[PDB]
Design a protein around this ligand. Structure first.
Ligand SMILES: [Cu+2]
Ligand SMILES: [Cu+2]
Ligand SMILES: [Mg+2]
Ligand SMILES: [Mg+2]
Lengths: 157, 154
């Protein structure tokens, strides 16, 4: 697959957090994504387990059932961020968190993701994902909600 | 960890049925208490090579919904039924449930596997699939069932 990286990946709580973008996409179920024709990019959060992940994920595994909120701000622009929620989905290169986004033209942008664990109150998937807690097969508690930021230059794609 | 027959390959996925001792899970109150159960039943679903839904080989297939039916051979004939739940343990993510059985003997285990877009799947509103030429994948598989036989000895 072809993609454009946003800065350098960041490591927290036994996970690698990377930001990427590509052209707007089409998704099933329809009507969840902003129409490809009314967007500039498809923004994505690539979250994979590092070695010795404390929540039982083997290295390189996709970290599922997370909830991601983003804020995108143009440097030198209005000052008001472009906000939204990402959705979990699968593409030809595998599962990820993404959203179709309309930007404010070419320039430098600041990107911030707020990453919610499976048990967060804000996470709508919390009733559907468990975690073993017994000695034999149990794992460490979930990480706390955190935020991650990068800068990037958008030219149009 | 005890295997239930041999894994089966369908729709670019490997499906294995296993069991182990009953477990404890967060959030509490979803699993049947370990003290009131005999086994923790599990469905191990991983992508094969050339999986049609975009999963690289060996990846856990997420957002599925699994229903099981366990019947004792020679017993009442009425199956033990339930729903599995997606969860993570020390060996990774899987679908599982704490189950009370009907003593030692031979059992028939059937799993019904629902794709992310199935009406029966409560996670359907939360998982998408790219459909465009560049990044898209093939449609989801249709709901299917897999069966095995196994001897339980505690
Ligand atoms: Cu996407
Ligand atoms: Cu389990
Ligand atoms: Mg990717
Ligand atoms: Mg296991």
């Amino acid at each position: 697959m072809l993609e454009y990286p946003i800065g350098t990946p960041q490591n927290l709580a036994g996970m690698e957090i990377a930001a990427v973008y590509l052209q707007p996409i089409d998704m099933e179920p329809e009507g969840h994504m902003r129409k490809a024709s009314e967007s500039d990019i498809h923004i994505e959060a690539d979250i994979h387990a590092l070695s010795n992940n404390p929540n039982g994920y083997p290295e390189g595994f996709w970290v599922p059932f997370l909830f991601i909120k983003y804020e995108i701000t143009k440097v030198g622009g209005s000052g008001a961020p472009i906000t939204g929620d990402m959705m979990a989905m699968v593409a030809s290169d595998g599962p990820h968190y993404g959203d179709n986004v309309k930007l404010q033209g070419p320039g430098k942008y600041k990107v911030k993701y707020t990453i919610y664990p499976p048990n967060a109150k804000e996470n709508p998937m919390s009733p559907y994902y468990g975690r073993h807690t017994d000695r034999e097969t149990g794992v460490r508690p979930w990480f706390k909600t955190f935020s991650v930021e990068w800068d990037f230059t958008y030219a149009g794609i």
